[PDB]
Amino acid sequence: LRKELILSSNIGQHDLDTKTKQIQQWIKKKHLVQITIKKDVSENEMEEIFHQILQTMPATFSSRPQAVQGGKALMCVLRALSKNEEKAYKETQ
Amino acid sequence: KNRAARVRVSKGDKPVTYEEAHAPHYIAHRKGWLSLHTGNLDGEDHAAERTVEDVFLRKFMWGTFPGCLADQLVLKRRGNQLEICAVVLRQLSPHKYYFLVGYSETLLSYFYKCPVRLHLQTVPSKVVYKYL
Amino acid sequence: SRYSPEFKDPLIDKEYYRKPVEELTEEEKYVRELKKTQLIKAAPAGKTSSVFEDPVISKFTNMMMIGGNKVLARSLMIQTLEAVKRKQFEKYHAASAEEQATIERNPYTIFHQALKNCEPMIGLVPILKGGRFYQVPVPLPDRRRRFLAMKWMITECRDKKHQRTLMPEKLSHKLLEAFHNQGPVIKRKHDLHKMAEANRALAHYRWW
RNA sequence: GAUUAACCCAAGUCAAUAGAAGCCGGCGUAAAGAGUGUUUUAGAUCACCCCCCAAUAAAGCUAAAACUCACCUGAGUUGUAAAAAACUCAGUUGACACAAAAUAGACUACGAAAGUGGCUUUAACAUAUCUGAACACACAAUAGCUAAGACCCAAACUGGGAUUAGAUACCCCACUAUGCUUAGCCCUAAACCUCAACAGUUAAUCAACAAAACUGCUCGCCAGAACACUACGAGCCACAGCUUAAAACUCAAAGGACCUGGCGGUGCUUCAUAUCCCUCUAGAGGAGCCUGUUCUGUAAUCGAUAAACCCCGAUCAACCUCACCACCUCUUGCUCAGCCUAUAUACCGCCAUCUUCAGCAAACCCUGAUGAAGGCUACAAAGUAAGCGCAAGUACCCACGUAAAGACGUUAGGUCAAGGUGUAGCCCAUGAGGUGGCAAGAAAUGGGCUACAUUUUCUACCCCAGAAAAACGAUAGCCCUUAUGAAACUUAAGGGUCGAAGGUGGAUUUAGCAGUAAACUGAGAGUAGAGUGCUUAGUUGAACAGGGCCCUGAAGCGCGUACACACCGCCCGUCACCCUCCUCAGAGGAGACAAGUCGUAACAUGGUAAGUGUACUGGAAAGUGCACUUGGACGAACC
Ligand SMILES: [K+]
Ligand SMILES: [Mg+2]
Ligand SMILES: [Mg+2]
Ligand SMILES: [Mg+2]
Ligand SMILES: [Mg+2]
Ligand SMILES: [Mg+2]
Ligand SMILES: [Mg+2]
Ligand SMILES: [Mg+2]
Ligand SMILES: [Mg+2]
Ligand SMILES: [Mg+2]
Ligand SMILES: [Mg+2]
Ligand SMILES: [Mg+2]
Ligand SMILES: [Mg+2]
Ligand SMILES: [Mg+2]
Ligand SMILES: [Mg+2]
Ligand SMILES: [Mg+2]
Ligand SMILES: [Mg+2]
Ligand SMILES: [Mg+2]
Ligand SMILES: [Mg+2]
Ligand SMILES: [Mg+2]
Ligand SMILES: [Mg+2]
Ligand SMILES: [Mg+2]
Ligand SMILES: [Mg+2]
Ligand SMILES: [Mg+2]
Ligand SMILES: [Mg+2]
Ligand SMILES: [Mg+2]
Ligand SMILES: [Mg+2]
Ligand SMILES: [Mg+2]
Ligand SMILES: [Mg+2]
Ligand SMILES: [Mg+2]
Ligand SMILES: [Mg+2]
């Protein structure tokens, strides 16, 4: 299932943590998490939000961050690491 | 809303004349033309010259008879004679009326190179067609 | 409408105006006396007392019209009628005397019967109960039925499937098919009826 | 702030602080009648005058419907707005509870209150005077804890299925604590009829609303809001609890009831007449082109920019127009200067807008206790109204229709660049003049023209024809000529050259009710020339016009309202943003200040009605379960 989230570049840390926990729940549930981030802010600054969100789950980018909405927003897709990918993570760990 | 030469209604304490009481669309239906000349007919010439002359005449008479005109002037043109029929208020002295009539007639005759007559009609106070 | 409400539509029937005065009921005599003192519109340029006048064909020509080209539309209609009659005459002559009894050659009759066959009995109308519209089957008035028949015929003719085929031939062929209860128009009517029957379960959604 | 003047007191004035004025007022909604009942001490004069229905405890019983089990029959059952999930259990008949008690009840009784509505029986419903507990005793729905049983059904939490941006909810399924019985605890409710007990009156009423106003007596309670159903102290079988309950910091309000307006994912009724939906016709949304705009670019205007902008100011830009940019030049300057410099949120002027409306109304009168406010009923009940608008009248071809007209106001709606104009600003320049130059397309989007053809295309003709038909299809591009002009690759027309995209177009959307839509043909405005634009004359000339109310809306009558900058409103909570105070070993709590982050919990039926108590759960408001309240409604003859 596709679970979608919409965020702002000026989202507070408490809201960000809450939505991070929600995304973790979805990933554990094995859902595709489509995250969109909208706006001054740089697109790299926005993509840092994706870095942090996936940092909290050392989940993987099924689709990498991409500019959308006329380039105003970024969008990405996260997925639960397959069994083989998780085994690779364990080995590298 | 249309504002063209319309006297907007008020508390009923605003006197107005027959000319002012009627919006533009009534022209030729309830009120005639304040200037009569052939310039605007089919195929005639010098419409602009006639109009400029009319405008200057109106401004000139207004400034020459300050606070004396009661209603708008009536310009008429017959051949080359120009006739300004005006309605004024019985306040200024008749001596000054006669002086200004002579002066206006002479100056306008010389300025527009055509005989000019001024026909004054004196009234006690501005005719109040209605109160708006 | 330049005509004031007082004006009434003219009636064009020589038989009606020549009906004997004795045959008139009280109400009919009253109607005539009232019309004696009523305002009547001018006779429209589309109809006349011509014995050959056909209102159905007049309406069909009007529906076929494109951009006020009454001349072209009427020309197409007469060409269609002539083509139908010629086809029927050819079939009649080429056919045996036994089946010549059934072979019909009146183009007007063929046209009327084809339209009547194509008329769809039950339509699908949107009906809204509780805020949601559904395509409920519903009876149709005769006016709507005739109009739908004519419109389906004309649209089928206008389709681009028949390329480089003149409208007279297209319409004559389709009219003959409909008369013999075949062809895309009859297929469409049956499809509408089939959809209505499939949606029969929603009939109660109607309130009128 | 300075200055001028004025005012008050005056050898004083008045900044700060302190004090002086503190109870016979109230308790339905503003704080206040404490959840209920009974004393002693006392108080009062209201003391002598003067059967039954649904209380409660115990014991017993069961009609309907469940569950389970038996039969046999079937492959489906449950689930809703639609589904998924869930079970192979489903139907008939029969047997069968420690669960809950249709109809009666349209009754209004019992009890002190909580509560009590299946049946029978036993016991039983205190006081011949009324008040009387934070000062004790006995009770106190639902929830909840303790220990043991029952468990049909329902059900917090939990799990699953949906829905969702998310869904810790609303919807569906399963199941647990729990609801039940026993013995203890707990002692809280919007425990509200928010209206204390007793006795009495209906007379001169009475802020508002609500359930009319009061008198006497008594007890309890109240004294701005919030901090605060809080901290501390105290008591308690209570251990995240209950009762009592402050203070500090902070504010000038908080609050109760109404009137008007707006608003309602507000109710009923009736409508929309090219109109909101279906229905008819023709279109746009798909291709090219013309053109406007937004963006990009440039040294290179400005204004409109939701309806009500977008072939708009312009009935028009090669120079000019021109207000733009670059450079150069002039300074009492065409002007008793000048400024297209800012302010349409100072204006006049002319307008859009509802308005495809019909109301606006001065001056009076009355009603409300003489409050904001309101003013209708025709078998008429407080309205009368001058004037404005509609209407009438008028142009066009009728008395039809189209025009015109369309008030008060709404959007601080447009225009300081038509012109003027207040204020502010420039004056060796933000003024004036001269030369040159920009005005393009990455690309999106609006309107129109051309087409996609066979009802077509070319030719003749203006309607009895002949050919074409993969060709149809540019007004696009390139080359040439011509018209105007001083200047033409860039403006227009004609010709040649090329025959391009395209094959009737998605959701969505425009216009039209008849000589209209549609198609076609002219003319005019403005220019030297210039539009597929604009105005307008004319030809041919249609189909539907019948149903409805989801949405748009309109009206009427109502309902609610925490909104009044009027829902684009208000407002809650978390998180982090700084100070004051309090509790605290540092951390919490409150308040204030104050812009954010995530939602939209509350105010409208606030989109799941709101809330009280209690329990579990959750970023967060909050969700759900049980009972209780209306401080919600159910549209108030029958339908
Ligand atoms: K199109
Ligand atoms: Mg107008
Ligand atoms: Mg209160
Ligand atoms: Mg007592
Ligand atoms: Mg007590
Ligand atoms: Mg209890
Ligand atoms: Mg249980
Ligand atoms: Mg109660
Ligand atoms: Mg409490
Ligand atoms: Mg406490
Ligand atoms: Mg304590
Ligand atoms: Mg329409
Ligand atoms: Mg397009
Ligand atoms: Mg502009
Ligand atoms: Mg602008
Ligand atoms: Mg120049
Ligand atoms: Mg220029
Ligand atoms: Mg300038
Ligand atoms: Mg304005
Ligand atoms: Mg009128
Ligand atoms: Mg008009
Ligand atoms: Mg404005
Ligand atoms: Mg503006
Ligand atoms: Mg300048
Ligand atoms: Mg060409
Ligand atoms: Mg030349
Ligand atoms: Mg060709
Ligand atoms: Mg809500
Ligand atoms: Mg709600
Ligand atoms: Mg609740
Ligand atoms: Mg829950």
Curated annotation (Swiss-Prot), chain A:
Localization of this protein: Mitochondrion
Coiled-coil residues: none
Function as written in the Swiss-Prot or TrEMBL entry: IF-3 binds to the 28S ribosomal subunit and shifts the equilibrium between 55S ribosomes and their 39S and 28S subunits in favor of the free subunits, thus enhancing the availability of 28S subunits on which protein synthesis initiation begins.
Family to which this protein belongs: Belongs to the IF-3 family.
Protein name: Translation initiation factor IF-3, mitochondrial
Organism: Homo sapiens
Gene: MTIF3
Whole-protein coverage range: 157 to 255 of 278
From Swiss-Prot, chain B:
Record's keyword terms, sorted: Mitochondrion, Ribonucleoprotein, Ribosomal protein, Transit peptide
Gene Ontology molecular function, alphabetical: RNA binding; structural constituent of ribosome
Subcellular localization, as worded in the UniProt entry: Mitochondrion
Single GO cellular component term: mitochondrial small ribosomal subunit
GO biological process: mitochondrial translation
Domain of life: Eukaryota
Subunit structure: Component of the mitochondrial small ribosomal subunit (mt-SSU). Mature mammalian 55S mitochondrial ribosomes consist of a small (28S) and a large (39S) subunit. The 28S small subunit contains a 12S ribosomal RNA (12S mt-rRNA) and 30 different proteins. The 39S large subunit contains a 16S rRNA (16S mt-rRNA), a copy of mitochondrial valine transfer RNA (mt-tRNA(Val)), which plays an integral structural role, and 52 different proteins.
Family stated for the protein in its record: Belongs to the universal ribosomal protein uS3 family.
Protein name: Small ribosomal subunit protein uS3m
Classification of source organism: Eukaryota, Metazoa, Chordata, Craniata, Vertebrata
Residues of the full protein shown: 36 to 167 of 167
Swiss-Prot record, chain C:
CC per GO annotation: mitochondrial inner membrane; mitochondrial small ribosomal subunit; mitochondrion; ribosome
Pfam assignment, any one: Ribosomal_S7
Annotated GO biological process: mitochondrial translation; ribosomal small subunit assembly; translation
Organism: Homo sapiens (Human)
Protein's name according to its UniProt entry: Small ribosomal subunit protein uS7m
Matching SUPFAM superfamilies: Ribosomal protein S7
Family: Belongs to the universal ribosomal protein uS7 family.
Record PTM N6-acetyllysine, positions in chain: K174, K194
Subcellular location: Mitochondrion
Organismal lineage: Eukaryota, Metazoa, Chordata, Craniata, Vertebrata
Entries under Gene3D superfamilies matching the protein: Ribosomal protein S7 domain
